[PDB]
Amino acid sequence: GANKTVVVTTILESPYVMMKKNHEMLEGNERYEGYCVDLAAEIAKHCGFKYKLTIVGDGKYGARDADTKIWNGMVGELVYGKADIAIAPLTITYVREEVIDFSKPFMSLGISIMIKKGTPIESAEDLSKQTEIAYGTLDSGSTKEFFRRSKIAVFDKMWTYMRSAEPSVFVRTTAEGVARVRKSKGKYAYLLESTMNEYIEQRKPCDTMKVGGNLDSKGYGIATPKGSSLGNAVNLAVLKLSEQGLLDKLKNKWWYDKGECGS
Amino acid sequence: KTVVVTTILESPYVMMKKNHEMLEGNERYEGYCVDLAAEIAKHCGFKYKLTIVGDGKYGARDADTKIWNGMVGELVYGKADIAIAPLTITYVREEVIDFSKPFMSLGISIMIKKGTPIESAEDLSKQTEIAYGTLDSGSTKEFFRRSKIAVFDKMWTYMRSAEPSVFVRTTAEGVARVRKSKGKYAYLLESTMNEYIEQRKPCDTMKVGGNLDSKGYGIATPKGSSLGNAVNLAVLKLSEQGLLDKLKNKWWYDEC
Numbered sequence: 001g002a003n004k005t006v007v008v009t010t011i012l013e014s015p016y017v018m019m020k021k022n023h024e025m026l027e028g029n030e031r032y033e034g035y036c037v038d039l040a041a042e043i044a045k046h047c048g049f050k051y052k053l054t055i056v057g058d059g060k061y062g063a064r065d066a067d068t069k070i071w072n073g074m075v076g077e078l079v080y081g082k083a084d085i086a087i088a089p090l091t092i093t094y095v096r097e098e099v100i101d102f103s104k105p106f107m108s109l110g111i112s113i114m115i116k117k118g119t120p121i122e123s124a125e126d127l128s129k130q131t132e133i134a135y136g137t138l139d140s141g142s143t144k145e146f147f148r149r150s151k152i153a154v155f156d157k158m159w160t161y162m163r164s165a166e167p168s169v170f171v172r173t174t175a176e177g178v179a180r181v182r183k184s185k186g187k188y189a190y191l192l193e194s195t196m197n198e199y200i201e202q203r204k205p206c207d208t209m210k211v212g213g214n215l216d217s218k219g220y221g222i223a224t225p226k227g228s229s230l231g232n233a234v235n236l237a238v239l240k241l242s243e244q245g246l247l248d249k250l251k252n253k254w255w256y257d258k259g260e261c262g263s
Numbered sequence: 264k265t266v267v268v269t270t271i272l273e274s275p276y277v278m279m280k281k282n283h284e285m286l287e288g289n290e291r292y293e294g295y296c297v298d299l300a301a302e303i304a305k306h307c308g309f310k311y312k313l314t315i316v317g318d319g320k321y322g323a324r325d326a327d328t329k330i331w332n333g334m335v336g337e338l339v340y341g342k343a344d345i346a347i348a349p350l351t352i353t354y355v356r357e358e359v360i361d362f363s364k365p366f367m368s369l370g371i372s373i374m375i376k377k378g379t380p381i382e383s384a385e386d387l388s389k390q391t392e393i394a395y396g397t398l399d400s401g402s403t404k405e406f407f408r409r410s411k412i413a414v415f416d417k418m419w420t421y422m423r424s425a426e427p428s429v430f431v432r433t434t435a436e437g438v439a440r441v442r443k444s445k446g447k448y449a450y451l452l453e454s455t456m457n458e459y460i461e462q463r464k465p466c467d468t469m470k471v472g473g474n475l476d477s478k479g480y481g482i483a484t485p486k487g488s489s490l491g492n493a494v495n496l497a498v499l500k501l502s503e504q505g506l507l508d509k510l511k512n513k514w515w516y517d518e519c
């Protein structure tokens with residue numbers, strides 16, 4: 001049929017998608033800025049479609065309820081036909097690839113540790129061997145599923161602690177995890193993707209840091225419903241933008257050019 | 264029936280075993296990609312035959328004839344069913360073959376003989392005493408040829424017309440040339456192979472600077488192959504189980 005506006009699901013996650021300072025008087029895509037906003041514009045230009053950015057209603061990345069088998073978050077938006085494409089820091093995973101399609105990765109990341117500066121923690125093994133410093137992850141995301149599923153001894157030990165910790169060590173948004181690190185006087189460490197860790201490390205008040213190596217190695221992909229006619233073009237678009245150096249330029253723009261913690 | 268796997272002799276991905284002359288079939292070979300092939304085939308449930316690519320090339324399309332050579336050509340022209348190798352995911356290749364999600368990350372990197380006064384690609388571009396080049400018929404050469412990025416464009420203009428040729432036929436020859444040119448040759452190659460060589464005797468090379476780009480190796484299949492979906496899920500499964508990390512540790516295991 002005639003061309004239709006593509007519905008893009010995304011999530012309010014800095015610096016991927018952020019409200020512009022004057023958003024209260026703006027409409028449509030103009031309300032937003034950030035890495036994924038710029039990426040969405042590039043992808044759409046290369047694939048030749050118009051689009052509408054829509055923030056996912058439940059503010060979640062996407063997990064499958066064990067009871068009802070219903071997908072929530074952005075994955076759910078794609079699975080149930082509420083969006084045509086997800087352009088967001090959405091991690092490529094086995095269980096998601098079973099139900100949606102992913103482009104080749106546009107950004108690499110690994111699970112990493114965020115501490116308040118001066119916290120006596122250097123590694124995941126460090127965390128697993130003590131109890132004074134609590135630690136947790138985001139809900140409904142790939143990091144929590146990583147620990148839940150891991151058969152690796154250290155990570156399994158961490159999961160058995162996290163799943164039963166009281167009060168809950170899990171948070172609903174990345175921002176909540178960051179606040180919890182900043183406010184807990186070194187007694188909370190946050191497990192999150194290295195991309196978000198490195199971003200926060202450059203924001204005032206510059207009181208956090210990433211420690212140790214990454215726990216795994218993965219990537220974000222642009223996601224489409226299985227069998228979507230958009231998948232092929234979007235995939236080539238990602239590889240073209242990568243080859244041209246544009247993805248590198250966008251990361252520099254949003255992570256480091258705008259960094260608040262010096263040169 | 265039996266899946267024909269095209270691969271290439273490239274340490275530590277695929278190597279001839281000691282006394283391979285008395286061995287046969289898949290048993291002749293060892294390495295990261297040999298182990299990976301075994302895991303993939305187990306998860307997908309097929310039997311396979313490892314075969315070394317006839318022309319010993321990764322794959323490039325000839326400008327005139329528009330014929331693909333190397334492992335890419337073997338997939339394009341139906342000589343193999345799947346490629347399991349350090350085969351780089353690129354735009355131009357994705358137009359003619361399919362790739363799994365990446366099983367290993369890499370970037371183009373600089374190898375120098377230790378003590379060479381080079382810190383970066385920018386450094387290389389702005390001098391002429393030290394010659395530099397890349398592998399033939401591979402993604403690295405194609406990257407520089409295609410690049411509009413100013414430093415890389417400048418490097419390409421020099422490399423394409425340098426005499427004698429700065430290009431080499433195999434990775435081993437690039438490394439040998441670095442080691443024998445007394446610091447007057449730098450080799451542009453993927454960080455994976457750079458890091459591997461860095462840890463092997465005579466310990467006289469090193470990787471300098473950051474990587475020039477960021478990409479990955481994928482398992483490749485002909486377009487519309489029945490194997491694509493299962494292979495892709497198998498890679499992600501192996502990744503999440505931590506086995507790709509274990510295999511990297513094994514074959515890049517630490518001479519220096």
Ligand SMILES: CCN1CNS(=O)(=O)c2cnccc21
Nearest residue numbers: 105218219364366367368502
């Ligand atoms: C090589 C590690 N790995 C596993 N396969 S993936 O999850 O598609 C991925 C994506 N991006 C970078 C790395 C990466």
Ligand SMILES: CCN1CNS(=O)(=O)c2cnccc21
Nearest residue numbers: 104106107108242365478479
């Ligand atoms: C994020 C960079 N990037 C470009 N897209 S790719 O070439 O499919 C790839 C593969 N592996 C890691 C990274 C990677």
Ligand SMILES: N[C@@H](CCC(=O)O)C(=O)O
Nearest residue numbers: 061089090091141142143
């Ligand atoms: N990128 C993750 C969310 C962040 C996290 O889980 O740490 C996902 O797609 O689920």
Ligand SMILES: N[C@@H](CCC(=O)O)C(=O)O
Nearest residue numbers: 321349350351401402403
């Ligand atoms: N991995 C490369 C070969 C090595 C190189 O080009 O440096 C390819 O697939 O072409």
Ligand SMILES: [Cl-]
Nearest residue numbers: 003004005006
């Ligand atoms: Cl419309």
Ligand SMILES: [Cl-]
Nearest residue numbers: 411412413414
């Ligand atoms: Cl430039």
